[PDB]
Amino acid sequence: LVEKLVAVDRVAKVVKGGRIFSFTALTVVGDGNGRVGFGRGKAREVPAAISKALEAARRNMITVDLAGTTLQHPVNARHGASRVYMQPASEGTGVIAGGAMRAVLEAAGVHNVLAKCYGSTNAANVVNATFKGLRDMTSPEKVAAKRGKSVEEIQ
RNA sequence: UAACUGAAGAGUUUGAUCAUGGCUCAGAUUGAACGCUGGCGGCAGGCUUAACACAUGCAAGUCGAGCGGGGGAAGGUAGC
Numbered sequence: 586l587v588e589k590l591v592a593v594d595r596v597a598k599v600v601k602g603g604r605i606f607s608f609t610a611l612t613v614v615g616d617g618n619g620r621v622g623f624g625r626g627k628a629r630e631v632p633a634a635i636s637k638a639l640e641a642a643r644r645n646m647i648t649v650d651l652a653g654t655t656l657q658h659p660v661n662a663r664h665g666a667s668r669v670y671m672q673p674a675s676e677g678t679g680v681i682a683g684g685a686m687r688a689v690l691e692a693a694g695v696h697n698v699l700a701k702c703y704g705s706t707n708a709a710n711v712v713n714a715t716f717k718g719l720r721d722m723t724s725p726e727k728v729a730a731k732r733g734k735s736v737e738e739i740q
Numbered sequence: 741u742a743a744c745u746g747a748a749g750a751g752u753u754u755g756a757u758c759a760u761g762g763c764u765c766a767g768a769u770u771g772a773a774c775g776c777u778g779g780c781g782g783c784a785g786g787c788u789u790a791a792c793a794c795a796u797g798c799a800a801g802u803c804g805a806g807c808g809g810g811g812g813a814a815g816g817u818a819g820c
Contacts, residue, residue, distance in 0.1 A: 597756045604755060666759060675745060683748045699747055705759070706749080 588639060589613045589688040591623075592708045593631060610634040611709055614642040615692025621719070622646035623689065623712050649719045654696035657725075662718030667710040668703040671718060685711040693719055 591611045598605045608631050615621035624641025628634035650657070656673040663669070669686065674697040680690055682700035685708045690698060702711060729739045 595756095599755050607756095670747085672747080678745075681746090681748060687748080701747055702749085707758075710758090 587615055587617055587692055588642075589692055590635060590638075591685055591688050591712065593634070608634045610638040611712065612638040612642050613688045613692050613712065614639065614646075615689075615694070617692070617694045619649045619651055619694055620646055621649060621689060621693035621716075623716060625709070647716075647720050649693050649722065650724045651694060652724075654694070656695065656698060657722050660718040660722055662714045662721070663704075664713040664717060665707075665710050666705040667707060667714050669711065669714045669718060670701045670703070671715075672699045673697070674699050683711070686715050688712075689715045689719070 589612065591613060593608060593610050596607050596609060598607070608628055610626045610628075610631070611623070612626070612635065613621065613623045622642045622645045624638045624643070624645055626634040626637030626639070626641060628637060652673070654676075656671060658673070660671040661668070662671075671682075671686075674681075676697055678697040678699070680687055680695065680698055680700075682690060682698065683702055683706075685706075686700045686702070689712055690700070700715075705711075725736050725739055729736050732739070
């Protein structure tokens with residue numbers, strides 16, 4: 586099970602006579618063959634936050650249907666102010682995307698894809714948008730089943 | 741046979757946060773200039789500014805089988 590750590594940030598909370606500092610961690614876990622999830626964790630120390638984030642990522646998982654090593658069709662997704670566009674590519678292209686998208690795509694098992702961010706580049710929001718798009722991608726068999734047709738009829 | 745296949749972000753407003761929004765950076769390119777340094781070859785390029793003023797040399801001649809004159813070389817013949 587491959588695990589990636591997207592970002593680590595230090596946050597502060599104000600009390601009388603000083604401030605309390607903490608750490609947040611965003612991580613993405615996956616199997617490399619269509620199962621992927623992400624999570625966040627808050628702690629006083631960085632390793633504890635990473636462990637909690639990994640546990641949350643393992644608890645929140647979905648299944649993604651791929652076409653070999655690439656996407657089925659172009660995808661547009663959004664979450665808040667972050668918008669993402671993803672497009673299938675031919676073999677040998679690679680993963681042409683930013684780090685936040687790259688982590689999710691590589692954990693989910695995509696090898697050739699072109700991706701682009703618009704709007705805000707906040708890591709959590711970008712991961713959310715990419716996750717939603719991968720969740721909502723469809724497939725010819727599902728399309729044929731829903732329309733009451735055959736795969737060769739659908740083309 | 742073939743004539744196309746293509747898109748990455750980062751820093752900075754606050755005691756944290758999300759958004760909006762400017763500024764800055766990572767690329768490619770040049771008829772370039774400057775600083776330090778400097779062996780060779782091939783192929784290219786070389787006043788972007790004053791359509792400012794120009795010394796000097798060259799950059800449009802050729803035809804005697806169109807024509808009349810006129811020159812200077814030799815040769816031959818004569819004499820002394």
